[PDB]
Design a protein that fits this description.
CATH class of the largest domain in chain A: Mainly Alpha
Distance between the termini of chain A: 46 Å
Helix content of chain A: 40-55%
Keywords: Flp, Holliday junction, site-specific recombination, W330, Flpe, DNA binding protein-recombination-DNA complex
Number of helices of chain A: 19
Largest sheet of chain B: 3 strands, mixed
Distance between the termini of chain B: 45 Å
PDB class: dna binding protein/recombination/dna
CATH architecture of the largest domain in chain B: Orthogonal Bundle
Strand order of the largest sheet of chain A: 1-2-3
Strand order of the largest sheet of chain B: 1-2-3
CATH topology of the largest domain in chain A: hpI Integrase, Chain A
Largest interface: C-D, 41 and 35 residues
Number of strands of chain A: 10
Number of domains of chain A: 2
Number of strands of chain B: 10
Order of helices and strands of chain B: HHHHHEEHEHHHHHEEEHEEHHHHHEEHHH
Assembly: decameric
Chains A, C: Recombinase FLP protein
Entry title: Flpe W330F mutant-DNA Holliday Junction Complex
Strand content of chain A: 5-15%
CATH superfamily of the largest domain in chain B: Intergrase catalytic core
Strand content of chain B: 5-15%
Order of helices and strands of chain A: HHHHHEEHEHHHHHEEEHEEHHHHEEHHH
Oligomer: heterotetramer
Structural class of chain A: mainly alpha
DNA sequence: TAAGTTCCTATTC
DNA sequence: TTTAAAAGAATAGGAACTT
DNA sequence: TAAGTTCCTATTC
DNA sequence: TTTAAAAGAATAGGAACTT
DNA sequence: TAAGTTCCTATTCTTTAAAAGAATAGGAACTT
DNA sequence: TAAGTTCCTATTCTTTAAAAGAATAGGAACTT
């Protein structure tokens, strides 16, 4: 990819390659300065700070779409998300004195007559059909859990391979359960899996994601759930069909010191996943272009919590901005696991008289040792995922 | 109304009518550009976004009160709630180059300040009202006693059965739902449904979309033990008022709703009435709560019973415990008033702060069991006959239920 | 006072009197425009909003000290706490076109090395920070907060010239300590707001309300039984039987009298004599320092007491330091606060609960004994000057507690 | 030291010496204005307020590293932590009109950004992880404490250094204080203070703390193989009062408990005798280990409420107005804290109580036997440390 | 087969 | 999706001596 | 006869 | 001492008619 | 020697403002 | 009569932006 090449190219070389384009003013050469120009405009406006893959990608597109130049008057202009265009224009000139640069703001700073004619148009005959469907999804009959199962099911046969089937369901259920984004699941450090105690379910599986959108680390969980949908089961299926992925570098920094060497899922999994979700459209919402896809899980849990009147948890669970890395309260999992119910009147979690009590089953599992069969059931993750974890999951699975 | 005419006038025409005023500079013409100017300043600062009736009304008043101009120097100024006055001034000029505009922040001149002070000095903000409400509450009478007394103050003083019916309905409705006037008025009569409630069997639910914070909420009506029965007042309301055509409330032009539950002006006569029959001192205070009393009453009721956790949900308050973004684009489902809320307000149950439970009052009549007796009852479609004006508008399932409940008593 | 006259003068008249000063340009006339000018600069910069007595007093002084003018060039300048000097200058001119005004910031941009140096050079060779030094000592040395409180309280016992002043000083001091309030917090109490309020640790305590506080955030002022030689109820008793209700002083230009308290608890000038007294009978060094805390001592003491005991969470609430329903917002003090300050209990850091001292007398039970016999409206007889002002329920309670204290057979039947 | 000389030099003289450097523009003279310039820039930006040793040291280094000048154009520039460079530049000029000064923010141009990036291209989290490891492994806090304490037992070259290291370490742990918290103790403030659990404990006072918020330092009898009183005894009988080093350009205090340079020697020692891996890490905690240990101890025992008080962490409950203006008495460390750390008791998280460990020796009763000489055992501190204290310690020791 | 990927561009958060 | 950069004041470390 | 007051000015919050 | 100012969108009120 | 010292430099922690407004403390001449 | 209406004006609630950055969704053209 372009970004990968950028990261491979030495700084001095980049500035070199950029300058060369202007010695023998060629349309073929100046029109390919987009990547380089992006890098430069950033390095300038941020004094050397590294640039993230996504951000670079975005800006590079913006520059490409706006780049225009006059080889005769030695002038060149383009758009860039910045407000100190001057400082940037100047710095650019210093690198290529002969030329005159013009940075055009990406954001508009709105003529009446247009606004009017546009209004006049509307008068005669928001455009968020996406929000309309999302309301329906939740507004009609089915409960959140019913919708979850149905979506989860839509991949069951439509998938071409067991791996993809396994991945889609795992990813979807994972996103819902943690109210996380695709990346929150994908960037998990497989080596961070641990067994953590929870006074309601005994123990739950916890892993860590560092490379999140807002760069605020958060935990991702997996736990036993009462009913036809059991996260542990899908985690099991996931593990026995997929393998660790080398952490893709996503920023120009050269930092090779401390960092995760692996990641839980493949970066491109999202494309196929969305493409799948799009086709097997279990609900209308998924037919809408640019409508939520992999995100859906996020929106679902966010709604679930708001509906249950537990918005206090929303922030913690969904990892947002509020006023060690903050952990999810014990009762959250109690609820989502379905072994308990939230009582509005007293505000406590009440377990369902259903026979199986998660706590007692963990104890039965915790007891009988001498069964490192976990490392035998999950060969590809052996040596990667804590054995204590692999053994627990393995047991739980066999033990049922 | 002016706003209605604004909505009826085609955009190009508005800009037309505005420009004309400046070709033959007349005082009679420039002094009437307020409405148009309001619309324009908005459209400009919001890039075509529609403007809401109330907001337009407000701004239009502000412009009217501040509009001043010099026909000779071709200059014109006025106040407008904005901080990017320049952008606005410029855009205005482009439409009428000859003139120079000056937008003054709504954030004055001494002689005015003075005369105004001189005025105040001679004649003998909301603090008094809050104190009076606390009084109203801190004296023998319970929330329900106060509710009944107010409800009664209209019983005789009203000039017509309709007005009497409307006032009581509105008041009780506002209290019961902890809603504002508008929360009751903008209900979509076509959204009435029967919804189950584990404490009362079923309750009537309707929907309001056009709320102050634009966050939709539900409005309810349910059987209540005691002298005051919401269902009864709903019955009286329905048999004396008729569906109201939904007033247009924004310049836009479409998620329709042809009707609304009450008349927009009902609030004026209602407050005027509440003011005169002043059942309590609080109502004598100028600018003191009027139609808002209902809301304050229930808010107090819940707090006093120590259930402030519900207050937010019932009063439909923007919830701040969840990220802004978590709200704006990730939440897609109206929060639900918890079942027990109605149990309490219905008076068929009581709240035990210690056991955190709803203790049914041994009153003979059991809400749940009576609904079953009513639900069994079939064929009797006397609902559409009892509420002719709402027939075809309000779900027949609802009209039949109410009708039965009423007759069945 | 000048401020009172300002409030009595009709707006149009003020502007009148001000303008007149500039028609027959006289030094005797222009030099007396300070009050008027203060009022005007405020009304202008605040669009008619009223001005508070203290603020007016302050600004008027600042203007008086800086006012200067040229009758020939028809120019006049002065300092005023503002940053939009221009808007102000203009508005002034419009009122008197002939003249040119110049508002000078009270708080300029703000020095020069050589000065800084010579100043340092001065110091190298060789009362506000000395204030903080003494306050630390006061608390740092032996004595406990309660010991210091008693000692100060006593310093007035024999140095006062009248029983009333003695009574007032001790009441005020103890009141300020107990509520961690300022002089004004005690002075502006609405005598008509006294009420009996329940407290799970002491049975009941006396509560009153102050609205006119510095930060305009209302707060409650309390009085309660305390175990030991210092009993707030006793000093309240002495206070009430020697002082009378004070008509509420008007403290803002508003004409509004429509609704407001007609009485205030203490006299505005009490603070002068009180500080003067505290200054002389200087029970401790701290009080000798010029501009050092005087009536404010109470506030510092309690703040320190709470910090020392590690209960800073209460500090804000009790001291009313700034940080739904249709309600006059006033946050109250948690029940346990009074438990502590009353001395009938102790704070246990390990569990965070209040533990009563096995001392025989338990306050709750005594309130019950008092609550039982009523009908003895002996309160209105003991506090004649407050009768009809302070709730009878309150006067009767205090009265009983007092009698039921010194002893008497009828009060013990 | 330079700073000491600064404090010894009269203000007028400093400004004198500074000005002289610019009359006969000499590289040898202008290049030595760093100290003086530091002082001045401070005095200017703070209107005469004194400057602290550490702060002066830091700024002086920054100026030295950036100072550059042109004797011909009579210009001089340097970096300084400030944002009102102009005001400063001006003031400087007024003192030496002929010259033009340029203050550069300490906290651009492409070629620099580039070369800097080119540099990086070619070439904190670990320490925290290592501490967690150190903690999350069999050995209890007290076991770790003893082991570290022992690592000096033989590796030390003198009895004094051995004595000092162990004392300092145990002191830091016990009080959850920094090096300075122990070093700046006023030896004349030692007292006997009552404790409802241990009878009495030794209390001293530190005024010159980092946050300038005074705090108390304690020493008390502890059950087990590690007894603070014993190490205090060893300390006292091998070291002696240190003259309080002046730490600001300006409130006497004739002595301090330890030597300012003790920390270097101590860290160097801790580094070599590395009892644990953590100590091998460059820039990893050294003398700071004690605080971290206690901080962890309290958190682990679930008593974080105490942490703030014991560690003297700036309180954020009471407002700044409250804290600044109206607070004049050091928050008292709760009695039970010492009960715990002394090991004569245990904390019951459920009953919220101190459960005395049936150990035979009762701390309270032994104090009484003692309460029912010292100046001869601690000659160097005689007349300095309260006799009441020296006698108590002396007894306790002999009575052992 | 295309569902799956691959590597940008377009949109949304 | 988010929203505190920096001054101010310690605690490590480096290098060359010292006991 | 000085502690108390009155009504500003100076300082501090 | 305190420290979010203001745009945006309801709910009261005033005045002159209607019934 | 090499741990232990000096005396800076390099790193890693902790705390942060300014001024309009509105009290409280003090100065003098007067009251009692 | 005045309560009840109109149609603004006056008051009193309520919630906030904008944009640089960083992901997720979609378009075309290859792969198992």
């Amino acid at each position: 990819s372009q970004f990968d090449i950028l990261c491979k190219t030495p700084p001095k070389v980049l500035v070199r390659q950029f300058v060369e384009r202007f010695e023998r003013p060629s349309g073929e050469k100046i029109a390919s300065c987009a990547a380089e120009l992006t890098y430069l405009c950033w390095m300038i406006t941020h004094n050397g700070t590294a640039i993230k893959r996504a951000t670079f990608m975005s800006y590079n597109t913006i520059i490409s779409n706006s780049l225009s130049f006059d080889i005769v008057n030695k002038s060149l202009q383009f758009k860039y998300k910045t407000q100190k265009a001057t400082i940037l224009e100047a710095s650019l000139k210093k690198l290529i004195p002969a030329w005159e640069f013009t940075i055009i703001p990406y954001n508009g700073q709105s003529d009446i007559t247009d606004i009017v004619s546009s209004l006049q148009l509307q008068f005669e005959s928001g455009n968020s059909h996406s929000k309309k469907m999302l309301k329906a999804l939740l507004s009609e009959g089915e409960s959140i859990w019913e919708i979850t199962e149905k979506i989860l099911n839509s991949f069951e046969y439509t998938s071409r391979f067991t791996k993809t089937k396994t991945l889609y369901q795992f990813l979807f259920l994972a996103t819902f359960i943690n109210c996380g984004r695709f990346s929150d699941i994908k960037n998990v450090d497989p080596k961070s899996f641990k067994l953590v105690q929870n006074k309601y379910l005994g123990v739950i599986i916890q892993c860590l994601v560092t490379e999140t959108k807002t760069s605020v680390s958060r935990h991702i969980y997996f736990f036993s759930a009462r009913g036809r949908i059991d996260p542990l089961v899908y985690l099991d299926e996931f593990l026995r069909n997929s393998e660790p992925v080398l952490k893709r570098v996503n920023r120009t920094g050269n930092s090779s010191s401390n960092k995760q060497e692996y990641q839980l899922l493949k970066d491109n999994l999202v494309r196929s996943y969305n493409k799948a979700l799009k086709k097997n459209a279990p609900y209308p919402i998924f037919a809408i272009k640019n409508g939520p896809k992999s995100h859906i899980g996020r929106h679902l849990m966010t709604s679930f919590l708001s509906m249950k009147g537990l918005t206090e948890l929303t922030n913690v669970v969904g990892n947002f901005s509020d006023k060690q890395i903050t952990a999810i309260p014990d009762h959250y999992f109690a609820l989502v696991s379905r072994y308990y119910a939230y009582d509005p009147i007293s505000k406590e979690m009440i377990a369902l008289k259903d026979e199986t009590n998660p706590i007692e089953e963990w104890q039965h599992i915790e007891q009988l040792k001498g069964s490192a069969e976990g490392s035998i059931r999950y060969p590809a993750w052996n040596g990667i995922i804590s054995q204590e974890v692999l053994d627990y999951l393995s047991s739980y699975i066999n033990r049922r």
